[PDB]
Amino acid sequence: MAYDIFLKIDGIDGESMDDKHKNEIEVLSWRWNIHQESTMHAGSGLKVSVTNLDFDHYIDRASPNLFKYCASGKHIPQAILVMRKANPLEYLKYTFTDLIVAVVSPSGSHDGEIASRETVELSFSTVKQEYVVQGGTITAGYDFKANKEI
């Protein structure tokens, strides 16, 4: 509807026809969070921690390869998530690195909404976000493997 969301995954093309994001994945919705690590005791393997990136898309050209990477555990160097108002300025960008496909969850319905869609979880060890005020860019990033800003 009113917002376009694109996900560019190294080695995992999507289907988008957009001029700026051709063959990226068109994303229906997405979420992730950073939070205090209070679950695990202090000596545990296993300070702050991050969830996976959870996103939804229509089942599309990326789906068999998301499945394949999930079953094999193959490492993904980077992925770029961009969101813009459908004025095209992509005001929001997350650049993730060192990802694994942790969950692939397809589903379908005879009903028009729902259709054939697929929830996906990607773990990532680093994230960097860029916001463009409308203007100038605010940026911040962190590496959760090294526990360091980037």
d(CA 7, CA 144): 21
- Using CA atoms, how far residue 76 sits from 41, 51, 65, 68, 98, in Å, is 30, 17, 12, 12, 6
d(CA 123, CA 145): 12
Work out the number of other CB atoms within 10 angstroms of the CB of residue 81: 24
Alpha carbon 6 to its chain centroid, in Å, reads: 9
Whats the size of the chain, residue-wise?
150
Contacts of 11 (CB under 8 A, 6+ apart): 65, 69, 74, 76
Residue whose token pair is 């980077």: 78
Resolution in A: 2.1
Q: Are 109 and 67 in contact (CB under 8 A)?
A: no
Question: Domains plus CATH for the chain?
Answer: 1-150 (2.30.110.20)
- Using CA atoms, how far residue 98 sits from 19, 52, 70, 125, 142, in Å, is 27, 12, 14, 6, 13
d(CA 51, CA 67): 20
Cis peptide before 66 (omega within 30 of 0): no
Query: C-alpha angle with apex 59: 57 to 64, nearest 5 degrees?
Result: 115
Q: Are 127 and 141 in contact (CB under 8 A)?
A: yes
